[PDB]
Amino acid sequence: LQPDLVYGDVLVTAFINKIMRDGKKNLAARIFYDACKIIQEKTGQEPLKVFKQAVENVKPRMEVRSRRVGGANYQVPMEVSPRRQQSLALRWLVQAANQRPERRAAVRIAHELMDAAEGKGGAVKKKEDVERMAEAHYRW
C-alpha cells in the first residue's frame, strides 16, 4: 500500500480502504480525516496516535480459524499471522463503527476508535472473545 496523503502512513491507507465503498477513495479519505479531527477536538490528543492504539488493541493473537480441508469444514486453534492481525483488526473496527448510533460515518468511526484506544467497545470485545475461544467433550 501507498502511504496516505496526510500522515504518510500505510495502516491509515488500509483503513481508508476498509471504510471505502463504490471505489470512492475520495469520500473514504475525507471520512477518516474528519474522524481524526473529531478525535483531536474531543480529546486534544494526536489522532494518529489514537488510531494506531485502537488498531493495536483490536489485534487478535490467537483464534479458532475456520478452514475447509478435504471437502469438510474444520475449526483449528492457531496463532494469527501479523498480516491477518491487521485485516481482522481493521475489519472489526469498521464492523463495530458500522453499528454505532450516530448519523455521520466520521462520528461513528471517531467514537469507535476512541473506545478501542481505551481498550473498550465492540471491536475490542470481539478480539477478547476470539482469543478466549482459542485459549473438551460437549463443547460450550
Separation of alpha carbons 109 and 81, rounded Å: 25
Separation of alpha carbons 19 and 17, rounded Å: 6
Domain count, the chain: 1
Tell me if residue 77 falls in helix, strand or coil. strand
CATH assignment at residue 111 = 1.10.455.10
Domain, as residue range, for 6: 1-140
Sign (positive/negative) of CA torsion 3, 19, 105, 91? negative
Separation of alpha carbons 77 and 66, rounded Å: 9
Closest CA to 90 of 48, 132, 52, 139: 52
CB 100 within 8 A of CB 65: no
Write down the experimental method used for this entry.
X-ray
**Resolution value, angstrom units:** 1.9
Separation of alpha carbons 12 and 3, rounded Å: 7
Taking CA atoms, 137 is separated from 65, 78, 130, in Å, by 19, 20, 20
| Residue 65, strand partner residues | 76
